[PDB]
Amino acid sequence: TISAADIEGAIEDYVSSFEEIGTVIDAGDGIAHVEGLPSV
Amino acid sequence: LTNLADELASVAKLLLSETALNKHLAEPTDDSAPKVRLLERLLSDKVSAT
């Protein structure tokens, strides 16, 4: 299963494969945490 | 079965060594089509159909 750093490129495409919608991952006391929204 | 076990162990070793790829392949997602595409792109070379 040996593979060089070429695999790197793949993820750059994968992240580049993905409007921007995030998801609330927790909320409390007027503070929310949102995963996603890389361009925010 | 032995070949499948060896391939799976090698894949697990690769994922453990390559943290970022593991993160990308493991982050939960409603649509698994991108996950399948990347997995088959990176693995189809050195794994069996099963």
Both tokens of A36, joined, read 């996603």
Nearest in space to A15 (alpha carbons), one of B23, B3, B10: B23
Both tokens of B20, joined, read 């970022």
Residue A10 carries which DSSP code? H
Which residues 6+ apart lie within 8 Å of B11 measured at CB? A1, B43, B47
Which residues 6+ apart lie within 8 Å of A15 measured at CB? A38, B24
d(CA B31, CA A37) in angstroms, rounded, equals 17
d(CA B28, CA B45) in angstroms, rounded, equals 25
Nearest in space to B24 (alpha carbons), one of A8, A31, A26: A8
Resolution (A): 2.6
Residue type, A32: A
Provide the experimental method for this PDB entry: cryo-EM
For residue A34, list its beta bridge partners.
A24
For A35, the closest chain B residue by CA position comes to B27
Contact map slice: B 6-45 vs A, CB within 8 A: 7, 10-11, 13-14, 18, 20-21, 24, 34, 38, 41-42
